[PDB]
């Protein structure tokens, strides 16, 4: 058993900046790796990219690169996830997820909650 | 063997300190490539000494907390008030860099490769971190790792930044303030290698980025572990011969 | 020659079953004591602080592979005893070659599969072989006993 | 060759048959090891026995062997069809040099034999524009391989340009043959309507072909 | 680089559909199905493997460049969209409706 | 071949994939001058002076250094050491006092 | 439990060099010797020489000692148990009678009396020493004809003339055709050529339906050239079925 | 069919003496390596935390008892070595039957009384007993050396 949730309805105008929470549970936090994907609606499903929570160690995807910044915080087990310098082209609605073992992090078998997003 | 070779459990962020060098070629070492969540092991067959400082004279300062017990401080700064940092030949390090390369491409396709400063994290992977004479070092990488090498002088001088309180391993609310250390220190190591990690998102410029890794601690020990391995001896074993339990009489 | 002279721990790991043959007191020694002898010669270096400040983190690691060390290695010399022969390196039984371990015949066995190749191949059936023998014991051990009634 | 082994030996189905290898003292027998194979004329060899008495591995306790002080000795029992092929043995030591037998046409006999089944092709239009005529005589399905060719041209003896084979094993155990004619266009075109003779069992087979046909 | 293939996606629930997916290198194959309200659930990790309550009709069955997800008996549940994820990349994706 | 009998041998040259707490080997030089606490380096045995290795002929074995217990036995004997090591060590916790900083130039 | 592959037919003059490889798979390529036997048709099949892999030792025979020199390359492991490897046997000063079809052999055990005596056996691959030039097998098809008017089938082939030298190979619709396969060797004419030709079986009632093609080639001339059977035709046996 | 087959461990506790001579290898293994064979193979379970946090409540209780059933068992192979017969299982002597220790005849003592019951009946004498042994040894060793010298 390993719960995720995150944050809900919010708001924004193109040219800003935001953040969201991503707190989980059943497993230590710090030894298994997540990631994020920019599920658009009609488009195919774009990775954003991955987080080791340990050290803080990153990696991201060009096109949003610069704009994304992953985060955590080991004392809440809370993943966030800042993305500054909105379009429409990114609208769509974000999921926080972590592989099925340590082992592999490419298979997802444990995904994220529902959080609206408008612009 | 009974036992392994001198294992030095040196404990660095990017670059691979004092080990063992390749013997042959430098070499390169990835569970996947593709897995672009993976470390990529490189080790170096020339050793690239890298000196580095904190010039400061310090002077030590008991202040006794008690009853038995005091927590030591710097009283003050003997001389000039300066920067941490550390030299290393950047001819040295680009030639070597000469050296990754090309063994890169062979893991690669002969797509030209270009290498960058760490993504994020904390200080410790984020920055060459690592003991220099009792004191932590932070070093700011972004000039060993801000190149491209295609087909077709002086020397480097890395910023510093000296943390007390620590916390290795990133433990449970449980950090190490390391006192000061008397005067000034200076050491040197040799790079031996590093801790390379990939960018998963395959550009039409591009073309491959390897930014330092270094978010785990496990890749330390398997840099030099590599080489062995532990099996269990199993001396009784079953075999038929002509040859009876010599009962034909009794 | 080959057989009288030096040749090392575990030497004969690719050397067919035959050729191992000679060199079990290698790898029949030190199974214990290759390393209590190392340990108590080494251990007495002019250091003093044998188990200062009582027991350690390295405490356990030795200790709790110490007392492995020697009951897995009792646990070869009980089979030797509960087989009825702990001669070692080499001992008939009267347990016979079921060929429905291996179909297969003398001169390649020995000759050209080797001990880790050989176990390899019969691994599954070890357990039943191993229960024969003991069955071939006891049957041996009232057979003795009838005897020592009547005479 | 060095060592003699008996170039001919027969034996009937369901039976067993010996082939025997002697040489002066340096090549058999006595302090010599000796083996046998099963070397098929038209493919890779196959071995049989070698210790001298142990079978080799995936062979059948048909095949025996024996070895005397000036001679070896072969036994195959309960013997098969697909056994019709050559066999020679060897003579060597530990160190060394294998030293191979003559060989034996080993002949198994006994077995139900069958008549042939001809397929006379002549040549086509774009190879006439070459230009050459060639009539191919095709042999199949029989055994033993025994056969007789005897070209006509205009009904006459037919002596030059006699292309023949020798019968090769198919690979159902049983035989197979072809055959051929060099000729020109200038005799081929005009001359009567071509044939091709063959045998088997003393019953003699034949295709008749036209040229313009 | 996925070539998730075929796009139109609409049968009965008494039928069966086999959804393929192309490749220029190797990996680690898998597949997923989005929901209303819900995100995308896995449902091979392997290939040949299959993910937690999947029963027997989920096939998995290619090894070549073309890999396909069969799920023979369908069903109401079976209505959303798949995806074939390999690494960090993504297919195409198909929707199936009522 | 003859009336086979199964025959038993203690000694041969077989082994098995495998995981045990394994011991340090500390050194000669390091040991005896004091440099008074460092590590769990003291509580080693001292290494062999004759580093002795055997060669093993026509052998082929994999290693894989990813799936390698070794390492997993590194940090765990790491960690435990500092721990340890800094167990009897001055607490700063009353230190938690308002810091009234000013810089230095 | 494996399998060897050599080197193919590599066409010669007489006073010239040729090498013949042999290379391993499914078993370890040290463990074991490499003998070497041809099949002169004058002599028989005689036995070359024999190399350990492992030491380096050898012993060749006495007639080609000085002739001969083999050689072997490095092992490459697949498994902890398997491998793949290299070895060599190059002959200078040829003449006509160092000719037939090559084997290269993997010995019979590791250790005993017939430790080299040979158990795995190469592919066999013809060699051929003359000074005379090389010639192409120029395809072509046959006018079908019937085998048998009883049964119903309809026979066809493709038709080879004038190569040199051996061997030449045919397949069916690039590997895609199974049974009724059918072929033959071929013989030296006066003038000194081979020709050799192939045949296969379907029935007469479904001609149209499925597509056949012989993948003919030849390795000396470089050629792989194609043929189909042209079905327009009047014969015997094969006009009463239509 | 009875002596050949199944039995179970401790399983003639309550058998004759007689019959319990079949199954002794029952309970002449697994005196050591009864727990030594099934502690290696259960505890490699994927736990991956063997002896986390180093030693604990469990971890004394087991090598405290560990080490007991070794020195215990060594101490019953110790009287085998020292009584001149580590065969096992079954051993004569020069060592005569003193009636004192038991008046009682043959017939009854093998097919009536069990060794549980046999055992209670001699435990006074067997410290007696097992001391004659010892020194029907170091006759038999002096014996030995005596001719040792003279060849
Ligand atoms: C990769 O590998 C490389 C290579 O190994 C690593 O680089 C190495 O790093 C280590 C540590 O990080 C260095 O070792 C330390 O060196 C310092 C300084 O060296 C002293 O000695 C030099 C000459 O050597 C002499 O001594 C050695 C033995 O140390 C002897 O073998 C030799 O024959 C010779 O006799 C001096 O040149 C040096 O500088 C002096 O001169 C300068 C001007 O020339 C002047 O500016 C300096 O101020 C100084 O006067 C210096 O004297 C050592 O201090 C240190 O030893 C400390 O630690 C041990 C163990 O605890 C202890 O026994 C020592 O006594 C000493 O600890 C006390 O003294 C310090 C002052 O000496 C003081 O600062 C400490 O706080 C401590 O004080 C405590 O004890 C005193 C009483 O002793 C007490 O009164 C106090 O109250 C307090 O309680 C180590 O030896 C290597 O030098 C360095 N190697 C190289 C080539 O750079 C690299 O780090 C690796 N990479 C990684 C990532 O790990
Ligand atoms: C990490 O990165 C790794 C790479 O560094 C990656 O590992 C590789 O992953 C792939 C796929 O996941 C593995 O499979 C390979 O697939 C090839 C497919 O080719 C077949 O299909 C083609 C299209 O259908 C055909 O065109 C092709 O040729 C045929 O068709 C032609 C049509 O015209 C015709 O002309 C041809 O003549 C031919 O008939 C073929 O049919 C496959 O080819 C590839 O190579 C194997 O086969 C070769 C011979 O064709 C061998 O030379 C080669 O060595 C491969 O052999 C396999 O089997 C051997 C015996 O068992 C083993 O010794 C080999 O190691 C290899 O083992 C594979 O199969 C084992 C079967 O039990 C299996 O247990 C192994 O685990 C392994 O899968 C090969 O099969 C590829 O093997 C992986 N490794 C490498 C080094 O590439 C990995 O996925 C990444 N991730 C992780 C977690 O590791
Ligand atoms: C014992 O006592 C305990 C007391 O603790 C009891 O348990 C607790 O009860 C709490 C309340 O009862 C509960 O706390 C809250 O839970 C909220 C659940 O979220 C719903 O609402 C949000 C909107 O707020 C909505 O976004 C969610 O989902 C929408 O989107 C998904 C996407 O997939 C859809 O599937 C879904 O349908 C839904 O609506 C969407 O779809 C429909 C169509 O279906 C459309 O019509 C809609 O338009 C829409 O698109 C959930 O439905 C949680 O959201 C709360 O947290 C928010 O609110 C607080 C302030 O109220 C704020 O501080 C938070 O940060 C967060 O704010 C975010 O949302 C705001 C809008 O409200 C937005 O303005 C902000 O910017 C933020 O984005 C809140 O946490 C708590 O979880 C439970 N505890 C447990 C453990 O269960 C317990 O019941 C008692 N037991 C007994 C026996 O008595
Ligand atoms: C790793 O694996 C490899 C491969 O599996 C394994 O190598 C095998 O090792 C076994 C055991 O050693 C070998 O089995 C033996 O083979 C002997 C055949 O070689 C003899 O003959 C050679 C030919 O000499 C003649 O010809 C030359 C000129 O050509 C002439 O000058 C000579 O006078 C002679 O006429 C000879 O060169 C060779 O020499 C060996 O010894 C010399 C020293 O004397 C040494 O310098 C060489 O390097 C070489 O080792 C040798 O004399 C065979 O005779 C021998 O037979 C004896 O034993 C068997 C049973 O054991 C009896 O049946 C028999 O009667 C004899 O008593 C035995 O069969 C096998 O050939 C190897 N195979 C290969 C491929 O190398 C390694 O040992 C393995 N290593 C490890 C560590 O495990
Ligand atoms: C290494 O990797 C990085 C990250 O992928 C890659 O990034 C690009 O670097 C260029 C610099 O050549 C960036 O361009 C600018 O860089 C300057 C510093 O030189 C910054 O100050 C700029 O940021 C500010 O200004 C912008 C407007 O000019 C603002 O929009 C911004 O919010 C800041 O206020 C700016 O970053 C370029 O932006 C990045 N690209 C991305 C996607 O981040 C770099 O090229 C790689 N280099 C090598 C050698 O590998
Ligand atoms: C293990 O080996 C034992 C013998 O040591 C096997 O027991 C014997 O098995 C044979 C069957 O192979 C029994 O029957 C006899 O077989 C021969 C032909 O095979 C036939 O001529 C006889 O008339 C009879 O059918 C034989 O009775 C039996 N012996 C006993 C005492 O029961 C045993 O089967 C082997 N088991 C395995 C798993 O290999
Ligand atoms: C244990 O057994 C030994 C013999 O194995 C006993 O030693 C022997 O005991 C007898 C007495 O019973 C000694 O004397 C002889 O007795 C018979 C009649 O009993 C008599 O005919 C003889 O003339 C003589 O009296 C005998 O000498 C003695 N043997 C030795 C070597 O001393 C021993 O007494 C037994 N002890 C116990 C506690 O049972
Ligand atoms: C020279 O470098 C270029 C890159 O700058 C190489 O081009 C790559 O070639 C490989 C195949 O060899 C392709 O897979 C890559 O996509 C190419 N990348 C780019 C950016 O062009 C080129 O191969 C190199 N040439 C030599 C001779 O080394
Ligand atoms: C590599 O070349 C591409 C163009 O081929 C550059 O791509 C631009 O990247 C910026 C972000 O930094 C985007 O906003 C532009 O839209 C991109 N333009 C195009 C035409 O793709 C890229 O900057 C180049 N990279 C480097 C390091 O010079
Ligand atoms: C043992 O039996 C197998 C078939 O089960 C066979 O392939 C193998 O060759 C046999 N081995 C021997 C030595 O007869
Ligand atoms: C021994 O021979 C058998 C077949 O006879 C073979 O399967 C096995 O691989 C051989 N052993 C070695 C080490 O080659
Ligand atoms: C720097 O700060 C110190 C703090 O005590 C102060 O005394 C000094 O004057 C400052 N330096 C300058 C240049 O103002
Ligand atoms: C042994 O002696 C006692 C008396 O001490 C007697 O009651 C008992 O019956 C005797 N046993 C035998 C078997 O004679
Ligand atoms: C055996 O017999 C004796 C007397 O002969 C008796 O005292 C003893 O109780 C009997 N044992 C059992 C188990 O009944």
């Known amino acids: 058993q390993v719960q995720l949730v995150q944050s809900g309805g919010q708001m924004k105008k193109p040219g800003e900046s935001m953040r969201i929470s991503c707190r989980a549970s059943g497993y230590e936090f710090i030894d298994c790796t997540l990631n994020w994907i920019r599920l658009a609606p009609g488009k195919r499903p774009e990775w954003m990219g991955w987080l080791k929570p340990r050290g803080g160690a990153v990696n991201y995807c060009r096109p949003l690169q610069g704009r994304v910044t992953m985060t955590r915080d080991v004392y809440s087990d809370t993943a966030f996830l800042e993305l500054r310098s909105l379009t429409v082209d990114d609208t769509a609605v974000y999921f926080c997820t972590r592989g099925k073992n340590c082992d592999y992090n490419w298979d997802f078998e444990h995904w994220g909650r529902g959080t609206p997003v408008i612009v | 063997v009974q036992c392994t070779h001198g294992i030095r459990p040196v404990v660095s962020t990017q670059l691979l300190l004092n080990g063992s060098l390749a013997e042959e070629e430098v070499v390169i070492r990835s569970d996947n490539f593709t897995n672009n969540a993976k470390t990529i092991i490189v080790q170096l067959k020339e050793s690239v000494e890298i000196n580095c400082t904190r010039p400061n004279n310090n002077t030590r300062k008991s202040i006794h907390i008690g009853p038995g017990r005091a927590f030591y401080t710097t009283g003050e700064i003997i001389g000039d008030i300066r920067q941490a940092h550390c030299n290393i030949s950047r001819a040295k390090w680009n030639d070597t860099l000469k050296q990754i390369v090309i063994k890169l491409r062979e893991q690669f396709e002969n797509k030209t490769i270009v290498f960058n400063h760490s993504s994020g994290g904390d200080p410790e992977i984020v920055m060459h971190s690592f003991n220099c004479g009792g004191e932590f070092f932070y070093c700011n990488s972004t000039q060993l790792f801000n190149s491209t090498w295609n087909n077709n002088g002086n020397t480097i001088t890395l910023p510093c930044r000296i943390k007390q309180i620590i916390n290795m391993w990133q433990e449970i609310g449980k950090a190490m303030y390391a006192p000061p250390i008397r005067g000034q220190i200076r050491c040197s190591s040799n790079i031996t290698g590093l801790l390379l990690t990939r960018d998963g998102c395959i550009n039409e410029n591009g073309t491959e980025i390897f930014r330092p890794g270094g978010g785990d601690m496990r890749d330390n020990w398997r840099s030099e572990l590599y080489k062995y391995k532990v099996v269990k001896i199993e001396p009784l074993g079953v075999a038929p011969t002509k040859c009876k339990r010599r009962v034909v009489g009794r | 020659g080959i057989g009288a002279v030096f040749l090392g721990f575990l030497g004969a790991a690719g050397s067919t079953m035959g050729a191992a043959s000679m060199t079990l007191t290698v790898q029949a020694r030190l199974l214990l004591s290759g390393i209590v002898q190392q340990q108590n010669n080494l251990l007495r270096a002019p250091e003093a602080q044998e188990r200062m400040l009582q027991l350690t983190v390295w405490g356990i690691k030795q200790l709790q592979a110490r007392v492995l060390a020697v009951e897995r290695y009792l646990g070869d010399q009980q089979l030797l005893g509960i087989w009825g022969c702990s001669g070692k390196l080499i001992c008939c039984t009267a347990v016979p070659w079921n060929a429905s371990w291996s179909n297969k015949s003398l001169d390649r066995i020995w000759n050209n599969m080797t001990w880790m190749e050989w176990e390899r191949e019969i691994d599954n059936y070890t357990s039943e072989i191993y229960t024969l023998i003991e069955e071939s014991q006891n049957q041996q051990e009232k057979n003795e006993q009838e005897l020592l009634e009547l005479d | 060759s060095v060592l003699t082994q008996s170039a001919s030996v027969s034996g009937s189905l369901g039976q067993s048959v010996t082939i025997s290898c002697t040489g002066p003292n340096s090549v058999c027998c006595s302090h010599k090891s000796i083996s046998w194979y099963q070397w098929p004329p038209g493919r890779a060899p196959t071995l049989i026995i070698y210790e001298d008495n142990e079978r080799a591995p995936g062979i059948s306790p048909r095949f025996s062997g024996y070895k005397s002080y000036w001679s070896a000795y072969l036994t195959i029992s309960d013997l098969r069809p697909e056994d019709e092929t050559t066999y020679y043995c060897c003579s060597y030591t530990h160190n060394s040099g294998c030293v191979f037998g003559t060989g034996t046409k080993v002949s198994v006999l006994g077995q139900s034999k069958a008549n042939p089944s001809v397929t006379l092709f002549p040549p086509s239009s774009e190879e006439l524009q070459a230009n050459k005529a060639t009539l191919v005589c095709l042999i199949s399905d029989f055994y033993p391989g025994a056969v007789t060719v005897a070209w006509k041209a205009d009904s006459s003896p037919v002596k030059a340009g006699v292309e023949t084979t020798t019968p090769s094993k198919q690979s159902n155990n049983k035989y197979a043959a072809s055959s051929y004619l060099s000729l020109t266009p200038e005799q081929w075109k005009s001359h009567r309507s071509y044939s091709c003779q063959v045998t088997h069992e003393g019953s003699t087979v034949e295709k008749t072909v036209a040229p313009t046909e | 680089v996925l070539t998730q293939s075929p796009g139109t996606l609409s049968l009965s629930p008494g039928e069966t559909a086999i959804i393929s997916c192309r490749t220029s290198q190797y990996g680690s194959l898998a597949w997923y199905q989005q929901r209303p309200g819900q995100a995308p659930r896995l449902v091979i990790y392997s290939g040949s493997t299959r993910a937690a309550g999947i029963p027997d009709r989920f096939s998995g069955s290619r090894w070549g460049p073309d890999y396909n997800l069969t799920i023979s008996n369908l069903e109401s549940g079976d209505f959303g969209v798949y995806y074939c994820q390999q690494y960090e990349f993504f297919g195409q994706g198909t929707k199936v409706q009522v | 071949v003859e009336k086979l009998w199964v025959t038993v041998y203690y000694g041969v040259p077989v082994w098995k994939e495998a995981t045990t707490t394994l011991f340090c080997a500390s050194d000669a030089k390091a040991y005896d001058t004091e440099v008074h606490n460092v590590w769990a380096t003291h509580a080693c045995v001292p290494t062999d002076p004759n580093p002795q290795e055997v060669v093993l002929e026509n052998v082929t074995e994999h290693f894989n250094m990813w799936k390698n217990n070794m390492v997993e036995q590194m940090q765990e004997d790491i960690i435990s050491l500092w721990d340890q090591s800094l167990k009897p060590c001055v607490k700063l916790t009353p230190l938690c006092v308002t810091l009234n900083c000013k810089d230095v130039n | 439990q494996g399998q060897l592959v050599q080197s193919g037919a590599e066409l010669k003059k007489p006073g010239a060099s040729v090498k013949i490889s042999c290379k391993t798979s499914?078993?370890?390529?040290?463990?074991?010797?490499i003998n070497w036997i041809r099949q002169t048709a004058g002599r028989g099949p005689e036995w070359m020489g024999w190399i350990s892999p492992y030491s380096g030792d050898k012993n060749l025979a006495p007639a080609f000692q000085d002739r001969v020199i083999m050689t072997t390359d490095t092992e490459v492991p697949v498994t902890s148990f398997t491998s793949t490897g290299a070895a060599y046997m190059e002959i200078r000063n040829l003449k006509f009678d160092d000719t037939g079809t090559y084997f290269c052999?993997?010995?019979?055990?590791?250790?005993?009396?017939?430790?080299?005596?040979?158990?795995?056996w190469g592919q066999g691959t013809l060699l051929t020493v003359s000074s005379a030039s090389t010639k192409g097998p120029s395809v072509f098809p046959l006018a079908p004809s019937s085998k048998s008017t009883s049964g119903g089938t309809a026979a066809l082939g493709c038709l080879v003339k004038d190569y040199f030298p051996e061997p030449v190979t045919v397949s069916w619709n690039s590997g895609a055709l199974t049974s009724g396969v059918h072929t033959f060797p071929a013989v030296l004419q006066s003038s000194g050529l081979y020709s050799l030709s192939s045949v296969v079986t379907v029935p007469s009632s479904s001609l149209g339906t499925q597509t056949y093609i012989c993948n003919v080639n030849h390795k000396p001339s470089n050629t792989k050239v194609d043929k189909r059977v042209e079905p327009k035709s009047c014969d015997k046996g094969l006009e009463v079925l239509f | 069919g009875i002596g050949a087959v199944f039995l179970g461990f401790l399983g003639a506790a309550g058998s004759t003496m007689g019959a319990a001579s079949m199954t002794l290898t029952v309970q002449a293994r697994l005196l050591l390596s009864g727990i030594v064979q099934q502690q290696n193979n259960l505890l490699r379970a994927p736990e991956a935390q063997e002896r986390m946090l180093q030693l604990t409540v469990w971890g004394i209780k087991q090598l405290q008892a560990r080490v007991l059933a070794v020195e215990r068992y060594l101490g019953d192979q110790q009287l085998l070595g020292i009584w001149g017969c580590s065969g096992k299982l079954i051993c004569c002597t020069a060592v005569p039957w003193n009636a004192s220790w038991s008046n009682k005849s043959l017939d009854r003592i093998w097919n009536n009384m069990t060794w549980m019951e046999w055992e209670r009946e001699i435990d006074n004498y067997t410290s007696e007993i097992y001391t004659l042994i010892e020194e029907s040894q170091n006759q038999q060793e002096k014996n030995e050396q005596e001719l040792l010298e003279l060849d």
């Open positions: 499914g078993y370890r390529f040290n463990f074991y010797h």
């Open positions: 052999a993997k010995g019979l055990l590791r250790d005993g009396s017939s430790t080299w005596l040979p158990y795995l």
